[PDB]
């Protein structure tokens, strides 16, 4: 009878909120979410939800791919790395593990 909606909102993680190329979008990575806002009107253009599930695994880092823009690299505390692309959502359901003990940081 009762149903539960998928979680929205989120707490902004301490990973740096990255600017897009040509400074028009801002990519803010929450816990369990990464969403792109526009700089001009301050309305969000996409919300890429991220399944986190193992009690405390957190999004460890996130950065634009320096080879090609409009990609990301999002990495958890356990071994998991996503290569999603903002303005779309291709890459959420296909992560790649890394065989860590616990992933403390990553930089691209």
């Amino acid at each position: 009878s009762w149903k539960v909606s998928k979680p929205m909102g989120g707490r902004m993680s301490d990973i740096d909120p990255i600017f897009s190329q040509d400074e028009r979008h801002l990519i803010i990575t929450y816990n369990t979410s990464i969403q792109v806002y526009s700089t001009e009107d301050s309305l969000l253009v996409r919300r890429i939800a991220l399944p986190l599930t193992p009690s405390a695994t957190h999004i460890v880092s996130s950065a634009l791919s320096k080879s090609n823009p409009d990609y990301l690299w999002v990495a958890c505390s356990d071994g998991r790395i996503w290569h999603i692309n903002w303005t779309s959502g291709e890459g959420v359901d296909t992560p790649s593990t890394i065989d860590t003990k616990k992933l403390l940081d990553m930089a691209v």
Binding site: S1, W2, K3, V4, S5, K6, P7, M8, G9, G10, R11, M12, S13, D14, I15, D16, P17, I18, F19, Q21, E23, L26, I28, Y30, N31, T32, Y37, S38, T39, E40, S42, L44, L52, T53, S55, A56, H58
Partner: protein
């Protein structure tokens, strides 16, 4: 102890790097040239340039663009800019919360700040106004990365904890908005040993953005956040906040007592510092008129709402769903009904400058409550769904009792005893039955004088026992409690129970990976809205 660092490259080759290490003691050490110092066994003497302005740990340090300026930000809510060509320093001093993260744009123009109260502002340089503002839910979070100034053993070490549930009402006349109590930042809220949440924000539920914010208790964003000794100041917490039937009034209670370290000279005999801080309490009861643009205005403030030889704690307030009336239960025993009258001293009314008369709230009724002392009492109250009867649980340990009071007359319609095992946590009134929780959880019908469902909840710690709470729906007759699964810490799980009014089987049993801090009922439709620790909001609906 390194809190952060930013490296800038001195250049299509890589000639050198310049490292700015922001340490946990407050300083920013700039190591000017590194590859030409460690390129060359033997090295020459390297010596960083020290830039010390922040008292607490510096949260973020970044070089700015061309490399002239070193922008930085710490707990002191001030974006600082080291000029670095002269010796000077210029700063954007009074933000809302701690500057938890900064970035610089690809061009030199924009900065983007992640402020500690769940916010991001893209500022433009030397206009210095936020050209882009994004706000979140700002509630209390059990943080993953713990803190940046919990590294060096301060006077009060900042602990990731939730001591009390979040104070929040979904507002009727606009059920997409949610009024909820927040502090200046999350770290500035939990710092000081007590929740210091002297602000509310209105938060849109249908499109999850923080719409607006306002102060309720006294706050000083433009003063220094930290005392001269090093303890962060605490601000008056808005404990009880509940909203009127019409959509046009709001009544809050905010408490503040001085810290325990501060007294030290009021002790005379058997008085300990906790007793002196409890004696010097300040419990204001403020009535707010909510405008159309979600702007709150004071109409009255009552300095001592329940008074005897000293001031008394106020345990709960409730709004009558049929009139504009607020009932407040205190520690003196009495339940007071406050109602709005017009300001009129001797027939000459006092009006606002546009012409409308000035309303003012005052105590319409006083009801002394009966006590039954078998050989620290807490209270709970709720109206009916109809009005005309107010149920008031009065709460000494194990022997406690509910009194059903008429509203039109001050007489007691009923008294019911022997229904509480421990100390009363809360009590709500669905259509005919009182749903109340102490150490037990009891649905107790008063039209039949018969308890339908009774549960003995599992024994847990005192923090979890404080963080259990419920909420009724009043449209589809269903109630919902919330309890973390058994001192509190980061990795805890919580499970909420959806019950109907009539049966004993729980109609939805769902556990959550993080502890939920608040449950609320949407007033227009059925269902509930729940707010988690790792602060995400999600709605539950039947159908």
């Amino acid at each position: 102890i390194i809190s952060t660092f930013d490296i800038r490259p001195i250049i299509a080759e890589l000639q050198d790097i310049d490292v700015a290490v922001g340490g946990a003691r407050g300083a920013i050490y700039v190591y000017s040239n590194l590859l030409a110092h460690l390129h060359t066994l033997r090295v020459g003497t390297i010596q960083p340039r020290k830039y010390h302005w922040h008292r607490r740990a510096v949260h973020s340090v970044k070089w700015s663009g061309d490399g002239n300026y070193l922008i930085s930000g710490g707990y002191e809510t001030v974006l600082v800019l080291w000029q670095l060509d002269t010796g000077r320093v210029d700063f954007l001093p009074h933000l809302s919360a701690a500057i938890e993260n900064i970035v610089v744009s690809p061009k030199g123009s924009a900065y983007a700040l992640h402020l500690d109260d769940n916010s991001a502002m893209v500022l433009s340089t030397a206009e210095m106004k936020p050209s882009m503002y994004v706000s979140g839910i700002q509630s209390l979070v059990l943080g993953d990365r713990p803190s940046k100034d919990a590294l060096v053993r301060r006077v009060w070490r900042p602990i990731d904890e939730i001591a009390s549930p979040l104070v929040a009402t979904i507002s009727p006349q606009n059920p997409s908005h949610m009024f909820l109590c927040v502090g200046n930042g999350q770290q500035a809220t939990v710092g000081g040993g007590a929740t210091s949440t002297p602000l509310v924000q209105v938060f849109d539920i249908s499109s999850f953005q923080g719409v607006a914010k306002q102060a309720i208790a006294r706050t000083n964003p433009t003063d220094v956040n930290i005392t001269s000794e090093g303890v962060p100041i605490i601000e008056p917490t808005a404990t009880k906040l509940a909203f009127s039937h019409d959509g046009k009034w709001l009544a809050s209670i905010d408490e503040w007592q001085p810290p325990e370290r501060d007294t030290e000279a009021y002790l005379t005999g058997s008085k300990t510092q906790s007793d002196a801080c409890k004696e010097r309490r300040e419990i204001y009861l403020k009535f707010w008129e909510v405008g159309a643009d979600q702007s709150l205005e004071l109409v009255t403030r009552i300095n001592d709402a329940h008074y005897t030889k000293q001031t008394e704690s106020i345990f709960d307030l409730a709004s009558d769903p049929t009139s504009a009336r607020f009932a407040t239960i205190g520690n003196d025993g009495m339940v007071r009904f406050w109602s709005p009258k017009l300001r009129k001293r001797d027939g000459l009314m006092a009006t606002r400058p546009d012409g409308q008369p000035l309303r003012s709230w005052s105590c319409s009724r006083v009801v002394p409550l009966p006590v039954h002392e078998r050989q620290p009492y807490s209270g709970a109250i709720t109206f009916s769904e109809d009005g005309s009867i107010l149920f008031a649980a009065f709460g000494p340990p194990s022997g406690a009792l509910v009194v059903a009071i008429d509203t039109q007359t001050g007489t007691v319609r009923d008294v019911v005893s022997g229904m509480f095992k421990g100390d009363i946590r809360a009590m709500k009134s669905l259509s005919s039955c009182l749903i109340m929780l102490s150490d037990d959880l009891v649905v107790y019908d008063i039209v039949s004088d018969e308890m339908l469902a009774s549960y003995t909840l599992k024994e847990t710690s005192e923090a979890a026992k404080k963080l259990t709470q419920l909420a009724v729906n009043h449209q589809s007759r269903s109630f919902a409690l919330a309890a973390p699964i058994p001192k509190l810490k980061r990795g805890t799980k919580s499970e909420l129970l959806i019950f109907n009014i009539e049966d004993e089987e729980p109609k939805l049993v769902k556990t959550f990976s993080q502890v939920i801090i608040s449950v609320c009922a949407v007033p227009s439709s059925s269902g509930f809205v729940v707010v988690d620790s790792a602060a995400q909001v999600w709605s539950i609906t039947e159908g």
